[PDB]
Amino acid sequence: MFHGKHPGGLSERGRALLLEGGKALGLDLKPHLEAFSRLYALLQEAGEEEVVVKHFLDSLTLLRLPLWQGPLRVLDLGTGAGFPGLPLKIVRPELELVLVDATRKKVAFVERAIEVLGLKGARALWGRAEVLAREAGHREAYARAVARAVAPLCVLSELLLPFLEVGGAAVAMKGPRVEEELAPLPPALERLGGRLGEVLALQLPLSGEARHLVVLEKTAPTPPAYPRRPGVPERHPLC
Numbered sequence: 332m333f334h335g336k337h338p339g340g341l342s343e344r345g346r347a348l349l350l351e352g353g354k355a356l357g358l359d360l361k362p363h364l365e366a367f368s369r370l371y372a373l374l375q376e377a378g379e380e381e382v383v384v385k386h387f388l389d390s391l392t393l394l395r396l397p398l399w400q401g402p403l404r405v406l407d408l409g410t411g412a413g414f415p416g417l418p419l420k421i422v423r424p425e426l427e428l429v430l431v432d433a434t435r436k437k438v439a440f441v442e443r444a445i446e447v448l449g450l451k452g453a454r455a456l457w458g459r460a461e462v463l464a465r466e467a468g469h470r471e472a473y474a475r476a477v478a479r480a481v482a483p484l485c486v487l488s489e490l491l492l493p494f495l496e497v498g499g500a501a502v503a504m505k506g507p508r509v510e511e512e513l514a515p516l517p518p519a520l521e522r523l524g525g526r527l528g529e530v531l532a533l534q535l536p537l538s539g540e541a542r543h544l545v546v547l548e549k550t551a552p553t554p555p556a557y558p559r560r561p562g563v564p565e566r567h568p569l570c
């Protein structure tokens with residue numbers, strides 16, 4: 332079984348892995364195979380298949396929190412090649428997504444993916460978080476924000492919280508270990524207008540690797556001091 336090949340897209344095996352992992356998360360990914368297969372093709376053009384199908388499914392674990400109903404404006408901060416934002420947008424088309432990265436080549440890739448996949452209401456944007464969050468067009472302008480593989484929580488919270496409207500929420504995607512990053516976090520969140528929401532432990536669908544989704548709730552406006560200038564949260568983190 333699963334012998335069929337594909338010159339520029341997911342193989343029969345890769346399609347089946349994606350569907351199976353999807354069903355484990357509670358998702359029916361059949362309507363979205365072509366979109367994911369195209370995205371896979373784009374990545375290859377820029378084990379191989381399995382690993383990508385895992386970036387897809389890791390991104391889709393966001394759907395294990397019911398945070399994504401309706402035309403919410405969502406920021407994917409530090410999106411790289413479009414993760415977790417592109418899979419999210421594929422499976423929740425009503426979301427109005429902005430995908431940010433400081434590296435032009437990555438933003439150029441996301442922009443191309445958006446067009447090739449024919450996504451509507453997704454924009455890639457080149458910029459730094461610390462600078463974009465001081466513009467009225469982005470500061471406290473999002474209902475949701477997400478980030479994967481960007482920074483430790485104490486730094487990442489200073490980067491994410493300023494983009495959220497009050498009442499909004501951010502998800503920091505993390506791996507198997509979060510105790511150390513969480514322990515000193517609540518007092519820093521309060522300085523930012525945030526508070527710690529749920530920390531959901533879950534297992535990645537095909538591999539069983541441990542993951543945590545860390546929810547940051549926006550409870551009050553962020554003081555003008557934050558975020559600090561580029562590089563400063565990283566070198567003098569709040570915790």
Ligand SMILES: C[S@@+](CC[C@H](N)C(=O)[O-])C[C@H]1O[C@@H](n2cnc3c(N)ncnc32)[C@H](O)[C@@H]1O
Pocket residue numbers: 408409410411412413414415431432433434437458459460461478479480481490
């Ligand atoms: C390790 S990559 C992870 C990319 C993607 N989120 C993923 O998980 O596949 C982190 C990305 O964050 C970007 N980045 C880090 N700090 C940033 C900042 N302060 N503002 C904008 N982009 C940032 C980097 O340029 C890089 O492409």
Ligand SMILES: Nc1ncnc2c1ncn2[C@@H]1O[C@H](COP(=O)(O)O)[C@@H](O)[C@H]1O
Pocket residue numbers: 563566567
């Ligand atoms: N230990 C520290 N904790 C927090 N901020 C600092 C610290 N040392 C310097 N700063 C501030 O961080 C910014 C850059 O400082 P520097 O790292 O000396 O370039 C400046 O606004 C300083 O006022």
